[PDB]
């Protein structure tokens, strides 16, 4: 099928990104590491679709701007994490 | 909008973010508005005086980031096969979009994060989360037309939303499970129309807007505090708590009219079996509301006696009393409303 | 394309985000189709736009042609692996570079 | 041809990335992949302008998280996994073998490279990225860029307020 | 800036005298190829259902 | 590209050979428990280097991520000046650089650009 | 024909590689002689004939000297970091404009930005891999350098780019045919050299090495093989960045001989400055980039956006 | 005063903003001058542009000398 | 997409004498060549834009190539030596085949062609301008508007709106 010969690989890569975002690693940063991994794969598919259009790749910039802000915001929340808990370990948070 | 000029901004940018989503004529445009909305809420939500608040700022962020990420994943996939923002005949690719949106709003199967982040929010924060943040997600689900997936969330929402709430004593955590149930009614109202949903949402926000103030004005966070709460006229305290009954949708009060119009339309559309599970499950929701009214309906209590006085903010209380008055006598104004016909 | 319920002035902001109307092989194909959606509305348009949607999708998505192409290649390989072809004459003469 | 080998490597590096635990091991895996994805994207496009931008953008994020990794997760451990090295090396050669015996006219992506375009296409004889990036700064889509600007500036107000610089440095107490 | 533009326009003007020539050539060979492909398709798949 | 990748590999091979010569050409002597000890001015070290190293430019560190992503939006300017509407291009570009300056001066005046103190 | 074409491209890169690798050896001698004459010293004068074979006389030692295997270092990372430091130094040369084509490189200006940023990881990884207190301080002193110069670097490149119309470096030749952009861009030339120093981590911005603050910075735990490549990779950066100053502000007549008389002179300037200025203070640089340079660079984008617009109307 | 303090403390932002202010001014001259010449209609066109004698655009052909 | 019923011209018709003349040789005569075959070029290029069917412009294309081949026969007859020197220079002077380098040899040719055929080199920007012609094809594309008589009708503003019968008609007329 068309979807299997052309769009399978990025999707299989995407789900592997999510399975990193949920696996049990001690440090919160392990979530941030896997966060921009997924974003890297989202860019890849979005770039497939935008190129089916002849001239629409400019929207890649729009996507990248929101990619950094969620990473940048994701990093700020970690900073605020440290200065109330002292450490970023997942097991240090109240389970609720 | 409580402390500094900065809080004023984040509130507005939240409004802009939500509006961009619900006014967008394409999935990609809609997704952008969600990102705008995301960072407008977190700074409002994070305060370092509380060890709990920063934890709340986390669980929301990880959940919402995943939701928008998976949401964008499917939207790209959706128009990779159809080449349109719309799918002619709904299929799996459209289901995936629905799953993300439900998690974005904390519907039943993916609600877990939602109560578990309510421990560390101020009351004014919970209102923004409970009411406004549910606009953009639920409003996009109106575009998608999958029945069984949406139908399953309703059945689980009313059930999990009710049974879970019986065991809580923290009002903030209790209202979360209460809000999950009202969310179930919306999604049921969303497979039939939107004008009902728009009406029903406005009333739901109205009641929650009221109950939040009463706790917010008197800083109550636990059931025991209700019994210890001091009021000059036990008649006054008795009447303030009569808003819970409206939140329970009892017909003598305004809070039933929303439930009522959702049944006159679901029944018109032959969804009889759904209403049985929903309306029946609402009783359990009505139950723990009465557990709160134990502190009002009985009206002579053993209370601590180092308080003789009520210290309350005027403007909040001034607006709260006005809102409460309609919440008890708002039924006879159904004549005026012309949005149901 | 989706229809916002709100349709406040904000929709003007993001309306023209992604389109096919800028120098595209399918610019005319989509304008007809989407026009027909505007004439009949969205829900009824999905039942009157059978040709326009299929043509537009076969102009952008191109699945209909790519999925012809593999049938030719696979059927070329199937013949050879069955011995029906030969190694010397496996492919036809290539096109000229200065073409297409 | 290298496109298929790029497919193999991006798959291979993703398998191991699922198994990294040490944050820097994750980072090295991610950095390597950011190279390949950047390379791969430019194959199926009229220019590599976006690969340059994407590469530049992520490298900014690469440095910053090392600074925080070296402050938060400084003391952690690696473990060479003989299961992993064999598994990746086993499939990697296996995948590389296929790419040599693949009908790699069929595997090529249908997206039109610049040369894949016709000779008659008059719009393909301008500067490499003129038209594509054009309407990023023309009516009406320009307002989207403007909307980002506030969004980025408003973000810049969010970090300082979340961060609360004055109440000290950051240490992994 | 004038001199660079002067030179550029001269280079571009040379294209417009050559560009029509190539298009004439390509069409007369683009068409010829299409016949061969329409004929290769016939032979390749005689026995397909 | 494909030319550059080949030379990229060829260079990497060449530079790799250089130490592979150095590793053999290097004089070889028995390694001592002290020869491989770290250098910290001749006195044994108190603290591993893998302890948490405090940070003071964390705030700038985040601002650096942002400011780059606006470099993605100024760079295309030149390329599309001959091809764009001059009012839209002129107006938008200016209100792009004013926004950046205003943001910078705002934080500079608020003292966020200064390090943690 | 075409098959032959890429063969020549290989030869050019190899020819450019060996020539650059040789020059950085002789640059190090030049650094010692010139820095030995600004100081009233004589400089290397004995070895061989008049000191010319001095740098070769040192390349012998740094390779007949044993590798160091630090006890507490992740050896594989510690062992590989020198390779990529040298590779990235040589690799960035493939974009240097030639009228006798070597590589097309439309968007060559960006390719500069990508490659130069990569040079920080090699320092960064080497310092952390060494697992010594000083080495780590050197690495994190280098990263903070990037946070400063990186953003201002792009903006200042953008100003030059507006003048030429494209990111292809070849166009610098045509526009610098009557005069030199140095005249139009005098403060940027002066600023650009300042940022160029940060790129190569030189005095007054010598923080990665950090000599006399850190014992030897991130190099403190390297020896014969690894340290040599770190050194060569350092001076390859100077040589290129000096050339990149000659193509931007000084004519860019790559095929003329004088261009190489100019190239060495800017190399002399880099040594000249090292013998004049004391090192900045680790924070004063980061404040300098954000407080002054970034604001400065943005101000002229308006000046050149207006000037290009005004010039566009006339032409 | 104010002018003095900045001119003494941060002279670059004053000089830099002085040229920045120059950009806006002579950008406002050039942009107005551009539509004072009808520069949208450019005598040299990218690509091979051919009009019919009856097309409305055929009237607006900018007639120049070289 | 091509099927049997789609009509492509037979192979013999597409055959026609071709230039087969390298790039540098073409760029040499560009300015003098352009002034001659402009009538054919514009006629050919005009149809190709309005009408995007390659087989439709088949007749015009043969005119364009014939004019090009016609021009070089003249050059072959007279300035053969000069043209080769100009082309050789233009080819071997830079990697772009820019005119800015070979101005000298160019002059030699321009004087040969203006002494043998009294032609003039057009100004540098002559061919970059918009070229308006008298369409000999005489079939400018038509204009039409689609018609949907079955469109979803709406309530027209002229429609009168009397009071509702018994009002809301809800439950107890409220
Ligand atoms: C007392 O107060 C003072 C201080 O306080 C302590 C100071 O710190 C200082 C500090 C001084 C400085 C920082 C000065 C700058 C110097 C340094 C940072 C380091 C010192 C080293 C140098 C100057 C030497 C420069 C060169 C290197 C380090 C090596 C670089 C690599 C090189 C040259 C190899 C290049 C590669 C090539 C292929 C070139 C061609 C061929 C060869 C080399 C091959 C050689 C031989 C063979 C292959 C053998 C073949 C044989 C056969 C076939 C038979 C001063 C001055 C001071 O006064
Ligand atoms: C060095 C510091 C000098 C002393 C403080 C600045 C004196 C010069 C006054 C300039 C105008 C006010 C700037 C300011 O304080 O930020 C806005 C401060 C608050 O700063 P903020 O830190 O809460 O962030 C403001 C965010 N926005 C811009 C979105 C509102 O006050 C206001 O926002 C409204 C009052 C403005 C007039 C105050 C004088
Ligand atoms: C978060 C942001 C991180 C940004 C930095 C990314 C790179 C940091 C990698 C640090 C080394 C990781 C490691 O220890 O793996 C050891 C691995 C081996 O993993 P290992 O698990 O076997 O190591 C432990 C060994 N035992 C079990 C004995 C204890 O060795 C390597 O091959 C790493 C090679 C690194 C090469 C140097 C990278 C420089 C890159 C420069 C820029 C790109 C050009
Ligand atoms: C004990 C616990 C179990 C209680 C009973 C649960 C079973 C309830 C019945 C199943 C759900 C609803 C069934 C239904 O839809 O009834 C529809 C029936 C057919 O009518 P019609 O409208 O013509 O059908 C559509 C056109 N063919 O016509 C009708 O029935 C419509 C009239 C209203 C039916 C309401 C039935 C729900 C009653 C719930 C009782 C809950 C228990 C209270 C104690
Ligand atoms: C004409 C513009 C007049 C601007 C007047 C600014 C005068 C003094 C500027 C200054 O630097 O004084 C110190 C003041 C204190 O700010 P502080 O929080 O300490 O941050 C570090 C500042 N170097 O620094 C500041 O607060 C602001 C410094 C940046 C102001 C730039 C304004 C440029 C406007 C054009
Ligand atoms: C190739 C061989 C080149 C060297 C041949 C030398 C023949 C001259 C007689 C022997 C001799 O003098 O060799 C040493 C030479 C000069 O003597 P030197 O040690 O430098 O003492 C100071 C002099 N002012 O010093 C030298 O010049 C020897 C340099 C040889 C090594 C150069 C490094 C590159 C490797 C070359 C192989
Ligand atoms: C094992 C895997 C082997 C596969 C090779 C992996 C190493 C990659 C090294 C090549 C990187 C350079 C590159 O490929 O650039 C490609 C692209 C060029 O595009 P363009 O502007 O058109 O210039 C073409 C000039 N002939 O420009 C780009 O795409 C951006 C390239 C940025 C390069 C950064 C330097 C990376 C160095 C290698 C790190 C490992
Ligand atoms: C012979 C060859 C000689 C080669 C010499 C090469 C020198 C290379 C090394 C240079 C680096 C020297 C050290 C350094 O980095 O200084 C940077 C400079 C120092 O100034 P700074 O530290 O900021 O002052 C104290 C701040 N508290 O930082 C700065 O402040 C510089 C800022 C430059 C701003 C220039 C603005 C120019 C404005 C032009 C217009 C001015 C005219 C009036 C306005 C006109 C309006 C129309």
Swiss-Prot record, chain A:
Any one GO MF annotation of this record: NADH dehydrogenase (ubiquinone) activity
Keyword Cell division: no
Subcellular location: Mitochondrion membrane
Topology with respect to the bilayer: Multi-pass membrane protein
Transmembrane segments annotated in the record for this chain: 2-22, 28-48, 62-82
Keywords, sorted A to Z: Electron transport, Membrane, Mitochondrion, NAD, Respiratory chain, Translocase, Transmembrane, Transmembrane helix, Transport, Ubiquinone
Matching Pfam families: Oxidored_q2 (PF00420)
Family according to the record: Belongs to the complex I subunit 4L family.
Gene for this chain: mt:ND4L
Record function comment: Core subunit of the mitochondrial membrane respiratory chain NADH dehydrogenase (Complex I) that is believed to belong to the minimal assembly required for catalysis. Complex I functions in the transfer of electrons from NADH to the respiratory chain. The immediate electron acceptor for the enzyme is believed to be ubiquinone.
Lineage per the UniProt record: Eukaryota, Metazoa, Ecdysozoa, Arthropoda, Hexapoda
GO biological processes: mitochondrial electron transport, NADH to ubiquinone
Catalytic reactions on record: a ubiquinone + NADH + 5 H(+)(in) = a ubiquinol + NAD(+) + 4 H(+)(out)
Entry EC no(s): 7.1.1.2
Principal localisation: mitochondrion
InterPro entries linked: NADH_UbQ_OxRdtase_chain4L/K (IPR001133), NUOK/Mnh_C1-like (IPR039428)
Cellular component, GO annotation: mitochondrial inner membrane; respiratory chain complex I
Gene3D superfamilies for this protein: 1.10.287.3510
Protein name: NADH-ubiquinone oxidoreductase chain 4L
Coiled coil regions, renumbered to chain: none
Organism: Drosophila melanogaster
UniProtKB/Swiss-Prot annotation, chain B:
Listed EC numbers: 7.1.1.2
Superkingdom assignment: Eukaryota
Cellular compartments annotated: Mitochondrion inner membrane
GO cellular component, one term: mitochondrial inner membrane
Biological processes, Gene Ontology terms: mitochondrial electron transport, NADH to ubiquinone
Residues that span the membrane, as ranges: 8-28, 60-80, 95-115, 121-141, 146-166, 195-215, 238-258, 273-293, 321-341
Alphabetized GO MF terms: NADH dehydrogenase (ubiquinone) activity
Catalysed reactions, semicolon-separated: a ubiquinone + NADH + 5 H(+)(in) = a ubiquinol + NAD(+) + 4 H(+)(out)
Outcome (variant: residue 277 to I): In strain: Oregon-R, SP1 and w1118iso
One Pfam family cited in the UniProt record for this chain: NADH_dehy_S2_C
Membrane topology qualifier: Multi-pass membrane protein
Keyword field: Electron transport, Membrane, Mitochondrion, Mitochondrion inner membrane, NAD, Respiratory chain, Translocase, Transmembrane, Transmembrane helix, Transport, Ubiquinone
InterPro entries: Complex_I_Subunit_2 (IPR050175), NADH_DH_su2_C (IPR010933), NADH_UbQ_OxRdtase_chain2 (IPR003917), ND/Mrp_TM (IPR001750)
Family to which the UniProt record says this protein belongs: Belongs to the complex I subunit 2 family.
General function of this protein: Core subunit of the mitochondrial membrane respiratory chain NADH dehydrogenase (Complex I) that is believed to belong to the minimal assembly required for catalysis. Complex I functions in the transfer of electrons from NADH to the respiratory chain. The immediate electron acceptor for the enzyme is believed to be ubiquinone.
Record-given protein name: NADH-ubiquinone oxidoreductase chain 2
Curated annotation (Swiss-Prot), chain D:
A Pfam family recorded for this sequence: Oxidored_q3
UniProt membrane topology term: Multi-pass membrane protein
The enzyme's E.C. designation: 7.1.1.2
GO molecular function, one term: NADH dehydrogenase (ubiquinone) activity
Enzyme class: translocase
Residue spans crossing the bilayer: 24-44, 53-73, 82-102, 143-163
One Gene Ontology biological process: mitochondrial electron transport, NADH to ubiquinone
Keywords from the UniProt entry: Electron transport, Membrane, Mitochondrion, NAD, Respiratory chain, Translocase, Transmembrane, Transmembrane helix, Transport, Ubiquinone
Function, as annotated: Core subunit of the mitochondrial membrane respiratory chain NADH dehydrogenase (Complex I) that is believed to belong to the minimal assembly required for catalysis. Complex I functions in the transfer of electrons from NADH to the respiratory chain. The immediate electron acceptor for the enzyme is believed to be ubiquinone.
Protein family according to the UniProt entry: Belongs to the complex I subunit 6 family.
Name of the molecule in the record: NADH-ubiquinone oxidoreductase chain 6
Naturally occurring in which organism (per UniProt): Drosophila melanogaster (Fruit fly)
Gene: mt:ND6
Curated annotation (Swiss-Prot), chain F:
Membrane topology designation: Multi-pass membrane protein
Major enzyme class: translocase
Transmembrane segments: 4-24, 60-80, 86-106
Chief localisation class: mitochondrion
Gene that this sequence comes from: mt:ND3
Protein name: NADH-ubiquinone oxidoreductase chain 3
Record-listed E.C. numbers: 7.1.1.2
Organism taxonomic ancestry: Eukaryota, Metazoa, Ecdysozoa, Arthropoda, Hexapoda
Reaction catalysed by this enzyme: a ubiquinone + NADH + 5 H(+)(in) = a ubiquinol + NAD(+) + 4 H(+)(out)
Keyword field contains Transport: yes
GO cellular component annotations of the record: mitochondrial inner membrane; respiratory chain complex I
Molecular function terms, GO-annotated: NADH dehydrogenase (ubiquinone) activity
């Amino acid at each position: 099928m068309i979807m299997i010969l052309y769009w399978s690989l990025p999707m299989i890569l995407f789900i592997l990104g999510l399975f990193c975002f949920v696996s049990n690693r001690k440090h919160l940063l392990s979530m941030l590491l896997s966060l921009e991994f997924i974003v890297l794969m989202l860019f890849f598919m979005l770039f497939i679709y935008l190129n089916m259009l002849n001239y629409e790749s400019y929207f890649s910039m729009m996507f990248l701007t929101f990619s950094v802000c969620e990473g940048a915001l994701g990093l700020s929340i970690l900073v605020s994490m440290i200065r109330t808990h002292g450490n970023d370990y997942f097991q240090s948070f109240s389970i609720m | 909008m409580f402390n500094n000029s900065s809080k004023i901004l984040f509130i507005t940018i939240m409004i802009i973010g939500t509006l961009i989503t619900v006014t967008s004529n394409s999935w990609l445009g809609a997704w952008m508005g969600l990102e705008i909305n995301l960072l407008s809420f977190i700074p409002l939500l994070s305060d370092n005086n509380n060890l709990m608040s920063t934890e709340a700022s986390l669980k929301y962020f990880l959940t919402q980031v995943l939701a928008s990420t998976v949401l964008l994943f499917s939207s790209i996939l959706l128009m990779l096969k159809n080449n349109m923002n719309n799918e002619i005949n709904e299929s799996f690719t459209s289901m995936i979009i629905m799953s993300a949106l439900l998690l974005k709003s904390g519907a039943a199967p993916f609600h877990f994060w939602f109560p578990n982040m309510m421990e560390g929010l101020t009351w004014m924060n919970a209102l923004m989360l409970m009411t406004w943040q549910k606009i953009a997600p639920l409003m996009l689900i109106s575009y998608l037309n999958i029945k069984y997936l949406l139908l399953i969330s309703v059945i689980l929402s009313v059930i999990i939303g009710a049974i879970g709430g019986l065991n809580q004593t923290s009002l903030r955590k209790l209202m979360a499970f209460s809000s999950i149930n009202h969310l179930g009614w919306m999604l049921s109202s969303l497979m039939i129309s939107e004008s009902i949903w728009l009406i029903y949402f406005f009333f739901y926000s109205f009641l929650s807007f009221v109950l939040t103030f009463m706790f917010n004005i008197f800083k109550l966070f636990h059931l025991n505090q209700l019994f210890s709460w001091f009021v000059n006229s036990k008649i006054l305290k008795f009447t303030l708590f009569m808003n819970f009954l409206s939140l329970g949708g009892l017909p003598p009060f305004l809070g039933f009219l929303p439930k009522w119009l959702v049944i006159q339309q679901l029944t018109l559309c032959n969804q009889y079996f759904m209403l049985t599970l929903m309306m029946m499950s609402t009783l359990i929701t009505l139950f723990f509301y009465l557990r709160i009214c134990y502190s009002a309906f009985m009206m002579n209590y053993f209370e601590n006696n180092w308080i003789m006085k009520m210290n309350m903010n005027s403007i909040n209380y001034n607006m709260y009393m006005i809102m409460t008055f309609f919440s008890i006598f708002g039924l006879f104004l159904i004549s005026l409303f012309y949005f149901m016909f | 394309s989706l229809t916002p319920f709100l349709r406040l002035p904000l929709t003007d902001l993001t309306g023209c985000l992604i389109n096919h109307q800028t120098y595209d092989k399918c610019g005319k194909f989509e304008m007809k189709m989407m026009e027909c959606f505007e004439a009949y509305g969205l829900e009824r348009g999905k039942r009157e736009c059978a040709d326009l949607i299929s043509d537009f999708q076969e102009c952008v998505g191109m699945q209909k042609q790519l999925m012809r192409f593999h049938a030719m290649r696979n059927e070329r390989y199937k013949q050879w692996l069955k011995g029906e072809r030969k190694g010397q004459e496996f492919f036809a003469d290539p096109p000229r570079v200065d073409a297409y | 041809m290298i496109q298929l080998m790029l497919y193999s490597l991006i798959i291979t590096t993703s398998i191991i990335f699922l198994n990294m635990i040490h944050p820097l091991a994750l980072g090295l895996t991610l950095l390597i992949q950011t190279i390949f994805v950047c390379l791969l994207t430019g194959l199926m496009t009229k220019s590599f302008w976006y690969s340059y931008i994407l590469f530049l953008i992520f490298l900014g994020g690469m440095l910053v998280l090392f600074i925080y990794v070296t402050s938060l997760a400084s003391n952690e451990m690696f473990n060479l996994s003989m299961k992993l090295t064999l598994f990746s090396s086993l499939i990697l050669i296996f995948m590389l073998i296929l790419s040599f015996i693949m009908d790699k006219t069929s595997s090529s992506l249908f997206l039109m490279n610049n040369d894949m375009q016709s000779i008659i296409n008059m719009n393909s004889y301008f500067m490499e990225n003129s038209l594509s990036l054009n309407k990023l700064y023309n009516f009406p889509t320009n307002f989207i860029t403007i909307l980002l600007m506030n969004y980025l500036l408003i973000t810049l107000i969010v970090i300082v307020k979340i961060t609360k610089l004055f109440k000290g440095p950051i240490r992994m107490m | 800036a004038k001199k660079v533009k002067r030179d550029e326009i001269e280079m571009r003007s040379a294209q417009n005298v050559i560009f029509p020539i190539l298009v004439a050539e390509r069409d007369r060979e683009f068409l010829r190829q299409l016949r061969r492909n329409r004929d290769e398709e016939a032979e390749l798949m005689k026995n397909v259902p | 590209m494909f030319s550059i990748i080949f030379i990229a590999l060829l260079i990497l091979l060449i530079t790799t050979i250089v130490m592979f010569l150095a590793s053999i050409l290097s004089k070889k002597a028995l390694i001592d428990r002290e020869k491989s000890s770290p250098f910290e001015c001749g006195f044994d070290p108190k603290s591993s280097s893998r302890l948490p190293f405090s940070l003071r430019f964390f705030l700038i560190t985040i601002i650096f991520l942002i400011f780059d992503v606006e470099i993605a939006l100024i760079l295309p300017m030149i390329i599309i000046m001959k091809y764009s509407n001059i009012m839209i291009w002129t107006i938008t570009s200016i209100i792009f650089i004013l926004i950046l300056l205003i943001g910078l001066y705002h934080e500079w005046n608020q003292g966020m650009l200064n390090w943690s103190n | 024909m075409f098959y032959m074409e890429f063969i020549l491209s290989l030869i050019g890169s190899l020819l450019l590689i060996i020539c650059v690798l040789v020059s950085v050896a002789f640059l190090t001698l030049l650094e010692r002689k010139v820095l030995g004459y600004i100081q009233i010293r004589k400089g290397p004068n004995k070895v061989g004939l008049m000191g010319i074979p001095q740098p070769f006389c040192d390349a012998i030692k740094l390779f007949t000297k044993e590798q160091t295997y630090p006890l507490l270092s992740n050896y594989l990372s510690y062992y590989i970091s020198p390779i990529f430091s040298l590779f990235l130094s040589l690799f960035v040369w493939m974009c240097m404009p030639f009228f006798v084509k070597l590589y097309s490189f439309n968007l060559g200006g960006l390719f500069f930005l990508c490659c130069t940023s990569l040079g920080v990881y090699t320092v960064m990884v080497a310092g952390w891999s060494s697992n010594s207190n000083y080495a780590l301080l050197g690495g994190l002193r280098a990263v903070a350098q990037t946070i400063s110069y990186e953003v201002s670097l792009a903006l200042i490149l953008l100003s030059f780019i507006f003048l030429i119309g494209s990111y292809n470096m070849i166009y610098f030749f045509f526009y610098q045919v009557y005069m030199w952009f140095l005249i139009i861009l005098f403060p940027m030339a002066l600023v650009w050299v300042s940022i160029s120093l940060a790129e190569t981590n030189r005095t007054p911005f010598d923080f990665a090495e950090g000599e006399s603050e850190l014992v030897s910075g991130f190099n403190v735990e390297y020896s014969s093989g690894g340290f040599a490549l770190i050194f060569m990779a350092e001076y390859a950066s100077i040589l290129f960045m000096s050339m990149l100053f000659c193509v931007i502000f000084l004519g860019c007549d790559v095929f003329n001989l004088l261009f190489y008389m100019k190239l060495t002179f800017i190399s002399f300037v880099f040594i000249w400055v090292r013998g004049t200025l004391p090192r900045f203070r680790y924070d004063k640089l980061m404040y300098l980039a954000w407080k002054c340079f970034l604001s400065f660079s943005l101000n002229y984008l308006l000046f050149f956006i207006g000037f290009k617009i005004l010039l566009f109307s006339l032409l | 005063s104010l002018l003095k303090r900045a001119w003494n403390e941060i002279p670059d932002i004053v000089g830099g903003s002085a040229l920045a202010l120059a950009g806006i001014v002579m950008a406002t001259i050039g942009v107005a001058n551009y539509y004072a010449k009808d520069g949208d209609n450019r005598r040299y066109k990218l690509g091979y542009v051919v009009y019919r004698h009856d097309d409305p655009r055929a009237l607006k052909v900018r007639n120049d000398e070289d | 997409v091509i099927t049997n019923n789609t009509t492509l011209p037979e192979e013999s018709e597409l055959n026609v004498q071709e230039l087969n003349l390298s790039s540098a040789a073409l760029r040499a005569g560009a300015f003098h060549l352009g002034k001659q075959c402009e009538q054919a070029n514009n006629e050919f290029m005009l149809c190709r834009q309005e009408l995007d069917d390659p087989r439709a412009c088949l007749a015009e294309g043969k005119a364009v190539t014939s004019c090009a081949l016609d021009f070089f026969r003249k050059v072959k007859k007279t300035c053969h030596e000069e043209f080769t020197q100009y082309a050789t220079c233009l080819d071997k002077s830079s990697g772009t085949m820019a005119f800015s380098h070979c101005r000298k040899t160019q002059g030699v040719f321009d004087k040969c062609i203006k002494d043998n055929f009294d032609w003039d080199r057009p100004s540098y920007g002559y061919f970059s301008r918009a070229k308006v012609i008298q369409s000999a094809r005489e079939a400018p594309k038509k204009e039409e508007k689609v018609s949907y008589p079955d469109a979803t009708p709406g309530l027209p503003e002229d429609y009168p709106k009397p009071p509702a019968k018994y009002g809301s008609r809800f439950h107890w007329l409220e």
